[PDB]
Enzyme design. Structure first.
Site, mmCIF file in Angstrom:
data_model
loop_
_atom_site.group_PDB
_atom_site.id
_atom_site.type_symbol
_atom_site.label_atom_id
_atom_site.label_comp_id
_atom_site.label_asym_id
_atom_site.label_seq_id
_atom_site.Cartn_x
_atom_site.Cartn_y
_atom_site.Cartn_z
ATOM 1 N N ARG A 533 0.558 -1.028 0.271
ATOM 2 C CA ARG A 533 -0.040 -0.025 -0.160
ATOM 3 C C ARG A 533 1.132 1.101 -0.026
ATOM 4 N NH1 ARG A 533 -3.924 -0.417 4.479
ATOM 5 N NH2 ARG A 533 -3.510 -3.136 4.508
ATOM 6 N N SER A 594 10.648 -3.958 3.215
ATOM 7 C CA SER A 594 11.067 -5.743 4.112
ATOM 8 C C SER A 594 11.416 -6.135 3.715
ATOM 9 C CB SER A 594 8.725 -6.080 4.682
ATOM 10 O OG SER A 594 8.628 -4.943 5.386
ATOM 11 N N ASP A 648 10.067 -3.397 7.923
ATOM 12 C CA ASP A 648 8.852 -3.049 8.802
ATOM 13 C C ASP A 648 8.412 -3.730 10.493
ATOM 14 O OD1 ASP A 648 9.918 -5.877 8.270
ATOM 15 O OD2 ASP A 648 7.864 -6.542 7.937
HETATM 16 O O1 LIG Z 1 2.438 -10.796 6.425
HETATM 17 P P1 LIG Z 1 1.550 -9.361 6.675
HETATM 18 O O2 LIG Z 1 -0.006 -9.641 7.063
HETATM 19 O O3 LIG Z 1 1.862 -7.859 5.326
HETATM 20 O O4 LIG Z 1 2.734 -8.271 8.230
HETATM 21 C C1 LIG Z 1 3.706 -7.927 8.010
HETATM 22 C C2 LIG Z 1 2.637 -6.142 7.924
HETATM 23 O O5 LIG Z 1 1.990 -6.181 8.121
HETATM 24 C C3 LIG Z 1 1.787 -4.642 7.824
HETATM 25 O O6 LIG Z 1 0.274 -4.301 9.039
HETATM 26 C C4 LIG Z 1 2.707 -3.444 8.428
HETATM 27 O O7 LIG Z 1 2.168 -2.659 7.943
HETATM 28 C C5 LIG Z 1 4.067 -4.227 6.837
HETATM 29 O O8 LIG Z 1 4.868 -3.083 7.168
HETATM 30 C C6 LIG Z 1 4.076 -5.277 7.551
HETATM 31 O O9 LIG Z 1 5.118 -5.931 6.589
HETATM 32 O O1 LIG Z 2 7.592 -8.996 6.391
HETATM 33 C C1 LIG Z 2 8.850 -9.129 8.260
HETATM 34 C C2 LIG Z 2 9.758 -10.086 7.992
HETATM 35 O O2 LIG Z 2 9.869 -10.640 6.469
HETATM 36 C C3 LIG Z 2 11.287 -11.483 6.346
HETATM 37 O O3 LIG Z 2 10.985 -12.258 5.181
HETATM 38 C C4 LIG Z 2 12.347 -10.410 6.018
HETATM 39 O O4 LIG Z 2 13.283 -11.136 5.553
HETATM 40 C C5 LIG Z 2 12.502 -9.307 6.851
HETATM 41 O O5 LIG Z 2 13.593 -8.173 6.476
HETATM 42 C C6 LIG Z 2 11.319 -8.688 7.698
HETATM 43 O O6 LIG Z 2 10.627 -8.130 8.250
#
Ligand SMILES: O=P(O)(O)OC[C@H]1O[C@@H](O)[C@H](O)[C@@H](O)[C@@H]1O
Ligand SMILES: OC[C@H]1O[C@@H](O)[C@H](O)[C@@H](O)[C@@H]1O
Ligand SMILES: O=P(O)(O)OC[C@H]1O[C@@H](O)[C@H](O)[C@@H](O)[C@@H]1O
Ligand SMILES: OC[C@H]1O[C@@H](O)[C@H](O)[C@@H](O)[C@@H]1O
Length: 902
Positions: A533, A594, A648
């Site tokens: 996003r 991330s 992240d």
């Molecule tokens: O796998 P997800 O649900 O995306 O979790 C990880 C993500 O969480 C979201 O809430 C954050 O805004 C992202 O920056 C993060 O990378």
């Molecule tokens: O999304 C959470 C984490 O995912 C991992 O796969 C990435 O290598 C990390 O840099 C990140 O912080």
């Protein structure tokens, strides 16, 4: 012979006159068919209440669930031992399945029976030891079946909680306890042999199994002996206490208790009441005491006394044997009712009682025997009648064709009982072609039939457990795993060791938590998680206004080119600028990328290596901040200031730290897993400088890529990793994150399925589909608010042909894996807080952790277990977890604020 004929006429003449009078005396024991229909109808109501969960708690007819789902099919094989206890004899058989069986009776005196549960079971064990000795099988490991003729509570088949003593037994300290375990204590106290009671079944169940082996129409099990009871195959959907909807299951009625609540207080007589006043279980088993062949004779005796006292018998003459409890027994009843032999037996016996019986008395005491043994047969006809109706109904047909397998002395031995019962039954249930099969061999054979199966299952449940056993880590391993991370943390923070450290401790140049002086309008990207996003965050020193729009990135672009991937990002940004009305002015952006990036300052970030689902070419080794710039150019539409490249974890940490100063650690458990914390600079060897801290993006998902976790990784773990994009990379993360757990669970099931333990041994295409078990579903499956029905549904929704049983195992597998994850993540987080308490040299630490990620957010257990683990693994710390509800964006904005500040 004109004599014998002459005599016979004499007795009938003599008889006739008296019978009228007696019929009117014991009118109370003359149950009309109408009344029998009434009783049949009342029993139905009691049966519905026992099965009903709503009414079961006060239902006298327990309708206990046995754990037998079908009669024998011939698939049974092997030599077993059967224990039969509670009937008239304590037999120990050795069935070997044609079916070859060897019995043995052991006397069980009125000291063991009315003794201590210990004494009783010690007796049972000794006899068993005797049998096995005699039989020469102690060496052979044989499965034991236990025919325990009493009311028990079973959740599984080798569970058997005694509810109440019945008939002749009454040993202290057994009721409430698991007879199976009690039996084991005796066999272990003796420590003579090795025995495994794999099954425990009632004698009606055993009788039904026995007959069904011979006659496949068998659906009922009846017993009319020391006690009376009946069992039958009922539909699972109606057995409220058991969760299932497919197939039937045998229900142990325990109808002897019918009337205990008072339902038969209009049937029961004063004689039945006195019989009760002096019984071993006053007020219990009321229906049974009117039918059973342990209470019958004594009931006749109580009548004789009443009449003799009233001068209606033996010219009112009483004797002390007539008053002694048990002088007149059921065998006397049976004999006295013999066809030709009846009247003289009445005499031979009655004189033995001391009263000089007249030819009249003999003729009377025989009629008295008829009314009492007949009321018994009529009452069982009524209640069995109900079971028969219930079966007919379950079949939907208007006509029933079933087989009731009987056993029991009173039935098998009384000369008038059997046919009277039969005739009366079929008058009550004319809508059925009921056959009866007498278990001539006894219950043992059927119990072996149950033990064979119970064993089979117990065996397959043992292998499944040999598997799951591996995803169950001891606190001691969670303790070592913790100690192992801490070592790794040192290796990436230290100059020399760094290049080798698998857990790289990446310097993110974020040196502090929001100082409350941040201000401005910042653009921010959030790439890496589930949703990409673009955001606009308007900070003002203090207020933060946020805005965002999710832009999906195709799997194709995502794993495309460095160009395709980055061109796509700029276009979304282009659109967002329009969407916001911000298009034009060059704005300060905070790139939340991330992924592992090597930075030397905020504004740069070289992608060290892709993790998770991204595998876009020519991206690794490049400064992503740079790639973002080239993409803006090729486009030639707008321009922006790539102020910071934040991870992240760091972004999440800040978003929370903004509101909560105590938050210095950032945890992410979603598609992937990682954490970061405010490390003292004194320790950050890779970065020159000596004052303050620096947020270290601990790339912990790699913990174990060198081998330090290879003692806990399973062959399933290896597979997931083998089939992944980054094979050999991100191991610690591969056994924790939502993008991987489902795959572990999926490979276990494929295993179990191949073994026939699940989905009837067939590997469905959906079972073979990668990612079929999403975080959304695992979370549901593992939910406690979800009924089993529902878990089964989800699985069917996924396309897997699950049964209720599959739905249980699947559910079990998911919990072993997610637990192991919640535990492993807890170990790592635990290490982080040691280093923090130790780095700042304090006796006790109170730190907050900012958390985000769909798995952490959706899963019912993960967070909870994980929280406990961190607590138990690190006692000198009181970690608080704060859920980040505004995403990494807000935090990435606060970073660009200070990032733009220089
Ligand atoms: O796998 P997800 O649900 O995306 O979790 C990880 C993500 O969480 C979201 O809430 C954050 O805004 C992202 O920056 C993060 O990378
Ligand atoms: O999304 C959470 C984490 O995912 C991992 O796969 C990435 O290598 C990390 O840099 C990140 O912080
Ligand atoms: O009271 P009873 O005559 O002993 O009847 C009940 C008993 O019948 C035997 O024939 C069966 O082998 C036993 O399993 C059962 O418990
Ligand atoms: O032995 C026959 C039956 O007698 C009843 O009184 C017991 O309560 C039952 O559990 C048993 O099946």
């Amino acid at each position: 012979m004109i004599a014998a004929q002459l005599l016979a006429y004499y007795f009938t003449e003599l008889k006739d006159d008296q019978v009228k009078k007696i019929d009117k005396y014991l009118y109370a024991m003359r149950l009309s068919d109408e009344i029998l229909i009434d009783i049949l109808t009342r029993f139905k109501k009691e049966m519905k209440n026992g099965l009903s969960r709503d009414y079961n708690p006060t239902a006298s007819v327990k309708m206990l669930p046995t754990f037998v789902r079908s009669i024998p099919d011939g698939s049974e094989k092997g030599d077993f031992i059967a224990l039969d206890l509670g009937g008239s004899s304590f037999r120990i058989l050795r069935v070997q399945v044609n079916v070859s069986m060897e019995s043995e009776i052991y006397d069980t005196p009125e000291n063991i029976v009315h003794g201590s549960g210990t004494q009783l079971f010690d007796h049972v064990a000794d006899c068993l030891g005797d049998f096995m000795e005699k039989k020469k099988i102690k060496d052979k490991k044989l499965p034991v079946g236990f025919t325990f003729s009493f009311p028990c509570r079973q959740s599984k088949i080798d569970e058997a909680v005694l509810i109440t003593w019945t008939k002749r037994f009454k040993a202290s300290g057994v009721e409430g306890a698991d007879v199976v375990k009690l039996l084991n204590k005796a066999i272990k106290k003796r420590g003579d042999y090795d025995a495994n009671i794999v099954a425990v079944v009632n004698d009606t169940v055993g009788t039904m199994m026995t007959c069904g082996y011979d006659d496949q129409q068998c659906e009922v099990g009846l017993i009319i002996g020391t006690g009376t009871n009946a069992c039958y195959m009922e539909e699972l959907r109606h057995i409220d206490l058991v969760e299932g909807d497919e197939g039937r299951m045998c229900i142990n009625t325990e109808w002897g208790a019918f009337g205990d609540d008072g339902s038969l207080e209009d049937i029961r007589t004063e004689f039945d009441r006195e019989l009760d006043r002096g019984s071993l279980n006053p007020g219990k088993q009321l229906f049974e005491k009117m039918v059973s062949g342990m209470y019958m004779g004594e009931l006749v005796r109580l009548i004789l006394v009443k009449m003799a006292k009233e001068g209606l018998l033996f010219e009112g003459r009483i004797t002390p044997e007539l008053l002694t409890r048990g002088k007149f027994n059921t065998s006397d009843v049976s004999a006295i009712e013999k066809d030709k032999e009846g009247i003289q037996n009445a005499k031979e016996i009655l004189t033995r009682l001391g009263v000089e019986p007249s030819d009249v008395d003999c003729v009377s005491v025989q009629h008295i025997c008829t009314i009492v043994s007949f009321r018994s047969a009529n009452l069982v006809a009524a209640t069995l009648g109900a079971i028969l109706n219930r079966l007919r109904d379950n079949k939907g047909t208007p006509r029933l064709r079933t087989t009731v397998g009987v056993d029991g002395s009173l039935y098998k031995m009384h000369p008038q009982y059997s046919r009277r019962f039969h005739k009366t039954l079929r008058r009550l249930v004319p809508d059925s072609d009921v056959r009866f099969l007498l278990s001539e061999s006894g219950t043992g054979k059927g119990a072996a039939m149950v033990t064979a199966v119970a064993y089979r299952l117990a065996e397959q449940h043992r292998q499944i457990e040999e598997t799951l056993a591996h995803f169950r880590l001891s606190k001691q391993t969670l303790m070592e795993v913790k100690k192992r991370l801490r070592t790794e943390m040192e290796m990436g923070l230290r100059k020399e060791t760094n290049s080798k450290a698998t857990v790289k401790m990446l310097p993110s140049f974020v040196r502090s938590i929001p100082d409350g002086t941040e201000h401005g309008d910042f653009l921010a990207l959030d790439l890496g998680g589930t949703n990409f996003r673009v955001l606009l965050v308007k900070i003002r020193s203090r207020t933060v206004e946020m805005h965002n729009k999710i832009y999906s990135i195709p799997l194709e672009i995502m794993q495309g080119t460095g160009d395709e991937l980055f061109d796509h990002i700029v276009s979304c940004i282009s659109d967002f600028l329009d969407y916001m009305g911000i298009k034009g002015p060059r704005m300060p952006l905070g790139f939340t990328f991330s992924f592992p990036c090597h930075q030397t300052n905020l504004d740069c970030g070289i992608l060290i290596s892709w993790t998770k689902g991204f595998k876009a070419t020519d991206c690794e080794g490049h400064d992503v901040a740079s790639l973002l710039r080239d993409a803006v150019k090729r486009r030639e539409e707008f321009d922006l200031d790539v102020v910071a490249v934040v991870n992240d974890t760091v972004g999440t940490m800040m978003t929370c730290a903004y509101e909560e100063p105590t938050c210095e650690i950032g945890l992410i458990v979603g598609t992937g897993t990682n954490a970061c914390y405010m490390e003292e600079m004194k320790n950050v060897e890779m970065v020159e400088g000596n004052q303050g801290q620096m947020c270290i993006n601990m790339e912990w998902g790699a913990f174990g890529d060198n081998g330090c976790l290879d003692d806990i990784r399973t062959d399933f773990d290896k597979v997931v990793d083998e089939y992944s994009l980054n094979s050999g990379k991100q191991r610690f993360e591969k056994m924790i994150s939502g993008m991987y757990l489902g795959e572990i669970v999926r490979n276990i099931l494929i295993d179990f399925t191949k073994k026939g333990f699940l989905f009837r041994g067939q590997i469905s295409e959906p079972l073979k589909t990668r990612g079929i078990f999403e975080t959304k579903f695992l979370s549901q499956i593992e939910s406690d608010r979800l009924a089993l029905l529902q878990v089964r549904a989800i699985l069917q929704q996924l396309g897997l042909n699950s049964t209720c049983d599959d739905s249980i195992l699947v559910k079990t597998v998911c919990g072993v894996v997610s637990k192991r994850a919640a535990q492993l993540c807890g170990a790592g987080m635990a290490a982080v807080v040691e280093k923090i308490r130790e780095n700042r040299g304090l006796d006790h630490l109170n730190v907050t952790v900012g958390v985000d990620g769909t798995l952490y957010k959706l899963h019912p257990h993960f967070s909870r277990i994980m929280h406990q683990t961190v607590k138990e693994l690190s006692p000198k710390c009181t970690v608080s977890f704060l859920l980040s509800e505004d995403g990494s964006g807000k935090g990435a904005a606060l970073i660009t604020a200070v990032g733009v500040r220089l």
